Amino acid sequence: ATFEIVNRCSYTVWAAASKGDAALDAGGRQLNSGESWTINVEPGTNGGKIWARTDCYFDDSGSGICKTGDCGGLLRCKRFGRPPTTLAEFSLNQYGKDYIDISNIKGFNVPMNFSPTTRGCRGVRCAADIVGQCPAKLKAPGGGCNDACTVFQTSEYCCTTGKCGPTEYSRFFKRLCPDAFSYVLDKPTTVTCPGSSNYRVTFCPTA
């Protein structure tokens, strides 16, 4: 599958692509404002994630730091990024279907459109100003809006027992982005695509 990753933000992001135990394609790259990065994701990729990182410093070997979505200080992510991270999530060729979603379960740093570039299902979008509106106790100092599970580390927010409900914090994310996961047991906003669909992830799709 091809993912085109486009930075429509006015600021530089460092795209990341990981399935949690491995990079997808190169796993990470600097995107200046307007730059496009095409990756190939293996068919059958289960639990793929794409995210943006903000305010990165990388030295010559690709080691450094980001204020949001840092993945063990690497330019080329092998692991998931540190919250807050708006997540493009995908499982490809799962019994002849692709499953895509956006999640705020790991919070929100960068607005995001996640759309197929092939036919047969709709894209999803979380492009509201969640950082600007972010409740005071979820505000990440480095930028972005933490989920309540990252901040408070409770069973209710992290859904540790596999039982929990929506919360004041989950409902803030859900109110601003109905089409994204707000908490672990949120009514699914998963979109079903045809197997071997191609995708565009756009950072700042409206800004």
SS (HEC) of the chain = CEEEEEECCCCCEEEEEECCCCEEEEEEEEECCCCEEEEECCCCCCCEEEECCECCEECCCCEEECCECCCCCECCCCCCCCCCCCEEEEEEEECCEEEEEEECCCCECCCEEEEECCCCCCCEEECCCHHHHCCHHHECCCCCECCHHHHHCCHHHHCCCCCCCCCHHHHHHHHHCCCEECCCCCCCCCEEEECCCCEEEEECCCC
9 — phi, psi (to 5°)? -65, 150
CA distances from 139 to 37, 63, 94, 150, 160 (A): 29, 26, 36, 11, 23
- Specify whether the CB–CB gap between 36 and 16 falls below 8 A: no
28 — phi, psi (to 5°)? -170, 150
Determination approach: X-ray
**Rounded CA separation 184/38 (Å):** 30
**Rounded CA separation 39/5 (Å):** 8
* Residue 51 CB neighbour total at 10 angstroms: 32
**Rounded CA separation 99/103 (Å):** 13
Query: Residue for token digits 């135990």?
Result: 21
**Rounded CA separation 97/182 (Å):** 24
Q: Which domains does the chain carry?
A: 1-207 (2.60.110.10)
